[PDB]
Design a protein around this ligand. Structure first.
Ligand SMILES: CCCCNc1cc(C(=O)O)cc(S(N)(=O)=O)c1Oc1ccccc1
Ligand SMILES: CCCCNc1cc(C(=O)O)cc(S(N)(=O)=O)c1Oc1ccccc1
Ligand SMILES: CCCCNc1cc(C(=O)O)cc(S(N)(=O)=O)c1Oc1ccccc1
Ligand SMILES: [K+]
Ligand SMILES: [K+]
Lengths: 833, 835
């Protein structure tokens, strides 16, 4: 195993390219299109094949390649879905190409048998029998061992080269008996008259090019043996390119030699010699002592345009050329039958399609895919028993063009996504040359057949879609991921370019939910806005040992982010390590995001069970509120029923407009099309008409489309004493009965626990406590039925009120209601203009 | 000052702009050339495209105050400033030349009317020119009087037009015994059947007749162009525009169907023709009742739908009324165009998109009337009338109008696509798909009219686009472009968060901890070389002021430094924070900066040149920052340059993840260092130097680094020169704590009160290390003096093991009087794929 670059790559691919076209139809295409146009066709195929060779060389030299060849190269340089689609397409294409080569062999054998006396059953049936027998022999030689395959390849290569040498030496020497058939030894007049094209039949330049192109195919057999190769980096590039050079030179030289020696038209009748009657005919045959005037209006069985096997006749010892044709065709068939199962093996090993897994088995020491050999045997056998392959030839040609085109596109994509890790170490390549190769392959496959190209395109698209939806886990970093990163970075830079405006103010939320999966209810509620309308950073502070915490954080970021992706959530999980909530919250609030994608609101889940929890946590909560207010953030406190007349807005306190913007953003969603926002405001009595008119005008200026505005004048009134005593007994644990108890002891138990609610605080904020209690009462009795409630949260200066008192206010305001969403903004958010 | 409202400002203006020359002249032509069915189909196509245009402009207008300026403002606040400027200029020109088109149509009608008379001033074309000149002069004169002055005129003109319609209708429902031979019958079903199908006798085809018909449709935006003087555009513009479109298309279809059953296609005005008996071969509807016409294609025929463009006027009783109606329609359309163009051009001039034009935004008068814009439109119209050949340029102006409509629809589609607050049109009856469809049909129709005109319009719009986007003006109004940029950034960041991170796709994402980037440009340039198009550079900066006032200073700093970075070619994000000291702000940034997978993974620090002069607390904080970065698995990169202003060399002394080689390679992938060849220096004992070289080559063969040559040094472990160690001792002497040569108590107290001092125990423990860096410095000086960039693995020491003063002394000694050395240290995670 581990073949060298001469044997593994150069011999294998050089043999694969040389096939049926070289010794049979090359002369025919030279006849159909003149020497110049035939060489132009050969050079078109050469440029497409050369760009493909350069691209596959660029991909192959970028690090080790495990195996599977073209599939591995493309699937690692490009995404796994393109890799899988191309792997399946190319595997099937090579499997069919095995049948195509074998049926070419079989029809050559049938022709050699027809010119002899014997014939077995019939041309087509004998083709079927010969093809079946030969595919069985090919399967046997392939499963006998890859070393035996290599020996067969090299012996067939020397046979083919001897055949070409026989042809050229025969071309040097003319023979008197070959004159009637059309052979003259390098006559300049023949070259002159054959330089022009003459397409007597329906064939056109595009038709001849499409017929010739299959000759150029098969260059990836060098790369398709990547698994069993000593050093693909140094083997694939030089071997492939030199093989392309050698085969194209041979093709052009042979075509020019045949076109310059054999006449376009001629009949085998020896009685056509023109002797001493030099007449007024300017045809290139007249001046060469043989007048083939009959072929103008009579069918002749010889000449370039009529005879396919003129290459055999022109060369001395024509049985040797027949053996050469057999060697070329069988070698190409064996190369295809070896290339297809290996690429299929790699494709199934990567398990892009879980349906196909049995064919990845590694029977033998070299991991030979014997089941792949059987599958390719069956495909080739079927396509041979069909026995009529010319109908599907454009299909396979378009499969090959698709594979080459996506190799070129993989090079262009990997080079476009400027990233470390794309270091091919093949200097001779370019982004634009590869892109040109890709577009050239697409136009060529369209030229060959306009509907086969569409069929191939739709098949590739279908496989792409199927793999995308059936996304498997893939470790190999493709150029798609690099391009995603580069696009994200470029778009972020461009966003940093544009200045901010109050019209396009996006709510950018920093949700302090610890474990996102813990409380998905308010997570979805915060997702109702900040979905295609703003970003959503689900922060999370980690506590514990410093150095080791990163490991935990890493796995956490791996888990929760995945969870966010698993649900239809558009949010980023941004973890930090901090000693306490305030430190990590400050980390995030200070340096979260980048560019202009910075959070501007701190969405906080309401701290349920604040009574049971340690009071240090509650004071931490209130200090977090204050920190958010100090850094110019908009706090949003959300209270839900986590275990499990539509939307109400309470524009009690004026701010930039966040308390009104959020309800509107909630309305424009599929869950709540029927929004029907009911707006409320605290207006003095005997002014409700004026306040309602003014608020309706303002809400028309900001197009929010309320349902009906209501004005309340009872918001600041003494509430029912039952609720007052409920609030008092709720606070009772956190009271500071300084007046009742002795001054010294009260000071002692106040300084050690500064969160205690001084009676002075209660006497100063009795009005505010009544306000919150009354707001809760009137809201509960009025809007008991509603799907969302929004209100402006109360705010007190840091240290002015105890954390216990502030949390008591928050809890009393939203004691037991439908989902409530208290809001507070900083700067202007909604603009009439 | 003046506020018309939808009753007069919008409805009347667009009503009278849609109606124009063709409403009576060429309508017979289209209904005859194309059957009633095909004529109504063409009317439906024009009506639907104009209807989506009206819906889209209504959606744009209803969104907030539209201020004043017309379609320019609507398309410039809903879309980028450059699209706005381009369409403003193009639509202003199109309306200005439409003034001339309507004036020359009026002149054509007048010259034909007086050619019916024997009077002729000079010549048909000369008389057309003179009539057009007089009409445009008086048109300007009436227009300059005031915006309210036409208010009466328009409406009275309107009733005249409407009364003319009535005249035609009452003419349709009464046949006259004397005028049967001159084309029409008394509303017979035979005429309806005969004229139902199409008959394109001349080269005119379906597309040709559609293009002939379309110019009538245009004119809806003239109501929106009065947005400057209009009470409440938000509510007014939708009602006026939609009702005007509905009523004008209804009247068009009504007149088309009425004419389609009244006048035969071909009719020779010969009274002598008349039949008396039934005959076989007269399938023509003419013979059906009284009068038979024949051979109007083989002889010069006189009347008929497809011959006489004024046949409708003959059908209409009391031809003077319908003639006055034609004059009223064309003049009213001219007024609408000449009032729409100056206002839109004034709005274009106000925003200073094109510095060349500035005088047209004067708006002299209390009504803010652009008199200079009026004069410009007058000059353009006078010239285009003097051309007197408007058929050649008609496709150009039609395509201008169609481009305006198309990009209005696309403005709606773009604003709706960029899901954003502030896009609350409140006009329910619209749809983003409908707007996109309208734009596509506008594009297809402008291509269908004439391909060459469409190409000219497209390239002109693209040229204006490029000019305005290159000459970016001082504009900020949160256009849909900015909203879509934000939405694209967010969506792409989410997608990136979707994908995993691979070694093969590793990137150097640098957090450059250097405040005030302009302070240290050169350093950033070197950081930019290996982070441009390969990673993200976050130019961090901590704010040291008091907390209360720190926010405004931070905002000013961020704005001005982002503007500075964008002014240069720099591709970096300025991320400032506030902290009690440099270390805490660095911790903030290293813990939170960047969202998703776009977060830093290396910390780039400039070398502390003034560590000798500066207070030792800052240097200790510098080293503490080094250690903190190492704690969070960051890779430190210390860069030292000469701030006042042959190949690259690498020193892979210590094996890290692989950054030490990745940075030089990325440097070589740039035009600045494209020619530089990565020489490599490593450490290896003498007896196995060659093997080491071989090994290194193989390593650099696996990672395709493409070096030049490898030099193995085995002397790095040897003692350095005595002079160099003497210099090192002199350097560190001020920070020395001579505990060996002083009493234990004084040395101890100097230690705790001054913890950063270098105790002689550290010196005796790390003599080997100190000699290592001194030797490395001297061999750097002798071996790689002439090198553009030097890369070295910086030393590391455990926290507390070595004094920060001594560590900074090592950093100082490792690089003295050297080219731009670049010390590196990876985070022990492999960054070179190997596969
Ligand atoms: C993707 C091409 C698959 C290989 N088959 C191909 C090979 C060559 C050649 O010389 O390599 C020439 C042709 S050819 N002269 O165009 O017909 C071939 O098409 C065939 C052959 C025989 C039957 C039907 C189709
Ligand atoms: C590691 C937790 C970091 C975020 N903390 C957060 C987590 C969660 C949750 O479960 O994800 C719920 C709340 S809360 N207000 O109860 O809904 C939390 O706010 C706290 C928690 C304790 C002290 C102070 C504030
Ligand atoms: C886009 C609008 C251009 C204005 N002129 C235009 C107006 C109307 C109409 O109905 O207001 C009809 C036509 S027309 N004969 O139907 O194609 C017009 O093209 C003319 C007319 C006469 C002179 C030159 C050009
Ligand atoms: K081939
Ligand atoms: K018009």
């Amino acid at each position: 195993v581990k073949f060298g670059w001469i044997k593994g790559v150069l011999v294998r691919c050089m043999l694969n390219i040389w096939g049926v076209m070289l010794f049979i139809r090359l002369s025919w295409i030279v006849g159909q299109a003149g020497i110049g146009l035939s060489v132009l066709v050969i050079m078109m195929a050469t440029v497409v094949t050369t760009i493909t060779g350069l691209s596959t060389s660029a991909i192959a030299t970028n690090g080790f390649v495990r195996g599977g060849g073209a599939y591995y190269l493309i699937s690692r340089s490009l995404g796994p879905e393109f890799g899988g689609a191309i792997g399946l397409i190319f595997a099937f294409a090579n499997a069919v190409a095995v049948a195509m080569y074998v049926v070419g062999f079989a029809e050559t054998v049938v022709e050699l048998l027809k010119e002899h006396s014997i014939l077995m059953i019939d041309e087509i049936n004998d083709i079927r029998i010969i093809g079946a027998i030969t595919v069985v022999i090919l399967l046997g030689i392939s499963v006998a061992g890859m070393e035996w395959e290599a020996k067969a390849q090299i012996v067939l290569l020397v046979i083919l080269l001897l055949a070409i040498g026989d042809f050229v030496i025969g071309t040097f020497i003319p023979l008197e008996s070959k004159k009637p058939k059309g052979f003259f030894g390098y006559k300049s007049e023949i070259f002159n008259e054959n330089f022009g094209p003459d397409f007597r039949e329906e064939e056109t330049f595009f038709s001849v090019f499409a017929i010739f192109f299959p000759a150029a195919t098969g260059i990836l057999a060098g790369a398709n043996i990547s698994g069993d190769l000593a050093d693909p980096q140094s083997a694939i590039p030089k071997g492939t390119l030199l093989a392309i050079l050698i085969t194209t030179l041979v093709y052009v030289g042979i075509a020019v030699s045949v076109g310059s020696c054999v006449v376009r038209d001629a009949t085998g009748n020896v009685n056509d010699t023109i002797v001493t009657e030099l007449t007024n005919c300017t045809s290139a045959a007249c001046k060469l002592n043989f007048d083939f005037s009959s072929c103008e209006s009579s069918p002749c069985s010889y000449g370039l345009m009529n005879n396919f096997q003129v290459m055999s006749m022109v060369s001395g010892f024509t049985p040797l050329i027949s053996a050469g044709i057999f060697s070329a065709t069988l070698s190409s068939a064996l190369a295809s039958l070896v290339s297809a199962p290996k690429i299929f093996q790699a494709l199934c090993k990567d398990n892009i399609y879980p349906a196909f897994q049995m064919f990845a088995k590694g029977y033998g020491k070299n991991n030979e895919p014997l089941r792949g050999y059987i599958l390719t045997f069956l495909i080739a056998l079927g396509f041979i028993l069909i026995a009529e392959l010319n109908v599907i030839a454009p299909i396979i040609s378009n499969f090959f063009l698709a594979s080459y085109a996506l190799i070129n596109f993989s090079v262009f994509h990997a080079s476009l996504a400027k990233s470390p890790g794309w270091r091919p170490a093949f200097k001779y390549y370019n982004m634009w040359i590869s892109l040109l190769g890709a577009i050239l392959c697409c136009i060529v496959m369209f030229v060959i057949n306009w509907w086969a190209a569409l069929l191939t395109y739709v098949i590739v698209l279908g496989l792409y879609i199927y793999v995308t939806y059936k996304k498997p886990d893939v470790n190999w970093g493709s150029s798609t991921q690099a391009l995603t990163y580069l696009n994200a970075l470029q778009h972020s830079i461009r966003l940093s370019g544009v200045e901010d405006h109050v019209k396009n103010f996006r709510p950018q939320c920093l949700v302090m939910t610890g474990a996102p999966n813990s409380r998905p209810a308010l997570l979805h509620l915060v997702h109702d806005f900040t979905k295609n309308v703003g970003l959503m950073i689900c922060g999370h502070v980690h506590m514990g040992p410093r150095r080791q915490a990163m490991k935990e954080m890493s796995i956490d970021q791996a888990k929760y982010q995945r969870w966010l992706i698993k649900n239809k959530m558009k949010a980023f999980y941004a973890p930090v390590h901090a000693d306490d909530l305030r430190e990590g919250a400050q980390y995030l609030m200070q340096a979260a995001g980048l560019g202009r994608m910075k959070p501007n609101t701190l969405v906080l889940g309401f701290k349920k069970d604040w009574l049971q929890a340690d009071m240090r946590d509650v004071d931490m909560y209130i200090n977090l509120f204050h920190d958010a207010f100090d850094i110019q953030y908009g706090v949003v406190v959300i209270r839900l029923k986590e275990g499990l007349n539509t939307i109400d807005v309470w524009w009690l306190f004026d701010d930039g407009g966040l308390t009104l913007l959020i309800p509107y953003l909630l309305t424009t969603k599929k869950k709540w099309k029927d929004c029907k926002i009911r707006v409320f405001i605290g207006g003095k009595i005997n002014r409700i008409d004026h306040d309602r008119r003014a608020m309706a005008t303002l809400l028309s200026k900001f197009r929010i489309d309320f349902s009906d505005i209501m004005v309340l004048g009872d918001i600041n009134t003494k509430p029912k004493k039952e609720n007052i005593i409920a609030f008092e007994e709720i606070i009772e644990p956190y009271r500071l009965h300084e007046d009742d108890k002795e001054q010294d002891i009260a000071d002692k138990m106040k300084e050690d626990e500064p969160w205690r609610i001084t009676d002075n605080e209660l006497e100063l904020y009795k009005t505010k406590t009544y306000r919150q209690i009354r707001l809760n009462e009137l809201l509960k009795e009025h809007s008991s039925t509603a799907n969302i409630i929004v209100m402006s949260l109360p705010v007190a200066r840091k240290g002015a009120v105890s954390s216990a008192l502030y949390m008591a206010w928050l809890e009393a305001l939203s004691k037991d209601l439908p989902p409530i969403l208290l809001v507070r903004g900083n700067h202007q958010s909604v603009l009439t203009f």
